[PDB]
Amino acid sequence: NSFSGYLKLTDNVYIKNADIVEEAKKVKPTVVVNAANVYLKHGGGVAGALNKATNNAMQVESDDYIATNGPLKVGGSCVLSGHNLAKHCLHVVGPNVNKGEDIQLLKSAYENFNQHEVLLAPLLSAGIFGADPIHSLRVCVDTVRTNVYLAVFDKNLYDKLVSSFL
Numbered sequence: 001n002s003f004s005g006y007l008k009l010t011d012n013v014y015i016k017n018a019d020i021v022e023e024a025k026k027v028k029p030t031v032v033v034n035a036a037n038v039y040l041k042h043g044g045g046v047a048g049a050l051n052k053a054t055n056n057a058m059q060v061e062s063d064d065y066i067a068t069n070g071p072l073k074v075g076g077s078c079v080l081s082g083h084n085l086a087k088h089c090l091h092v093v094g095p096n097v098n099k100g101e102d103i104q105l106l107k108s109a110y111e112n113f114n115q116h117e118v119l120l121a122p123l124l125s126a127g128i129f130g131a132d133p134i135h136s137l138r139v140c141v142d143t144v145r146t147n148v149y150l151a152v153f154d155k156n157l158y159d160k161l162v163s164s165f166l
């Protein structure tokens with residue numbers, strides 16, 4: 001199957017009201033982005049959902065990556081297997097502004113997307129990371145230069161983002 005049902009916001013940013021796990025299972029994209037933390041502990045939010053859909057195979061692989069490589073930096077990324085969801089999973093760490101991490105690092109986090117021509121992704125630093133999701137979409141539009149297909153689960157949030165960008 002291929003991406004379908006997206007609204008084009010800019011030349012390269014698309015958005016859909018969808019569960020990213022279901023999108024990944026339908027499309028099997030080359031790259032799905034995870035909203036990760038520095039130790040790749042996929043406990044909740046989008047990370048918990050993607051790891052559960054791999055039946056914990058992502059967590060076991062992530063623990064081995066950390067033991068061998070050490071933690072990521074805030075604003076950084078690594079490429080690991082996508083298992084049943086994608087060819088690859090790009091684990092990206094946005095700042096957790098509720099813990100005083102600098103919002104400037106949200107631009108650095110989105111810069112990692114430019115290494116891939118096409119990605120399925122969530123908004124970074126939204127949810128438990130504490131950033132305003134509309135601000136995160138603005139940074140995505142201002143920073144990502146490759147084609148990104150954004151999945152937003154919550155309908156109320158999705159409608160607010162589309163109203164702000166149209």
Ligand SMILES: O=C(O)C1=C(c2ccc3cccnc3c2)CCC1
Nearest residue numbers: 019020045046049126127152153154
């Ligand atoms: O897209 C959303 O509505 C947002 C979040 C979320 C959280 C958990 C999810 C689990 C499965 C699939 N999608 C998810 C999405 C947290 C911030 C905004």
